[PDB]
Amino acid sequence: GHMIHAISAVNRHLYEDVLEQHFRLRHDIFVEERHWETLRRPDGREVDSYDDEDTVYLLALEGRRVVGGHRLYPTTKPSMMSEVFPHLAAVRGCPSDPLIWEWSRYFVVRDRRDGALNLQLMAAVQEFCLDQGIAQVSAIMETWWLPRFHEAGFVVTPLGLPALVENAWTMAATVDIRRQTLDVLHDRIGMPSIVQQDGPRLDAVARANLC
């Protein structure tokens, strides 16, 4: 059926129209729904400094329609946490490791909310990272994510004190990538695999080491 596609520099030649579609959806969702005004752009494309040649996109596709997704960025490069929110990780420190990738821009289009897609996206990050040998993901997230992580069996390590970010309680954390976590989620989503990887093989950890 419908899968989450891993899109990176090595295979984005197969996904250019999907990528542009998702940048516009990100504008509709993060700017026009969430009112994250600092991200507003006059081209109607929500693209930031962490959308470059090293970004990996995990996008939920129904045919060629983007219905959800999230992205991963190597912490061996300057990251959102290290550059924008380092104060959120003052207790434990901002991650910087080929085996830790920064996880952001999680979305589900309105048509697919409160359905099966959300748990599939949770499974997708675990599946991709385990495949790649990535040990943890790091994130800056609003505190309402904590019960969502717990519901999916995500092992969470807070990195600092929660703080207000533009009127919203926000925190920095890592999530442990676990085979055990993934196995339970595969059972729950009723599929042995949720991540589709078309085109040339991606060696994410090798690429992060170059950075």
Ligand SMILES: CC(C)CC(=O)SCCNC(=O)CCNC(=O)[C@H](O)C(C)(C)COP(=O)(O)OP(=O)(O)OC[C@H]1O[C@@H](n2cnc3c(N)ncnc32)[C@H](O)[C@@H]1OP(=O)(O)O
């Ligand atoms: C990598 C990640 C950890 C860091 C991030 O990227 S944070 C960015 C979060 N993204 C967004 O807010 C984009 C706009 N929203 C969406 O795409 C979706 O609403 C999702 C957040 C993906 C959740 O979709 P899904 O689980 O399918 O279903 P729902 O939308 O009904 O949400 C389910 C329950 O999640 C909670 N929730 C979702 N959005 C918010 C919010 N803004 N503030 C507080 N709580 C929220 C809420 O409990 C909701 O259930 P109800 O209380 O509405 O019944």
Ligand SMILES: CSC[C@H]1O[C@@H](n2cnc3c(N)ncnc32)[C@H](O)[C@@H]1O
């Ligand atoms: C990630 S927590 C949500 C807050 O982070 C902000 N944000 C998300 N991405 C970026 C970025 N690349 N640079 C600066 N602020 C950002 C949003 O505008 C919102 O205020």
Ligand SMILES: [Cl-]
């Ligand atoms: Cl661009």
Ligand SMILES: [Cl-]
């Ligand atoms: Cl984000």
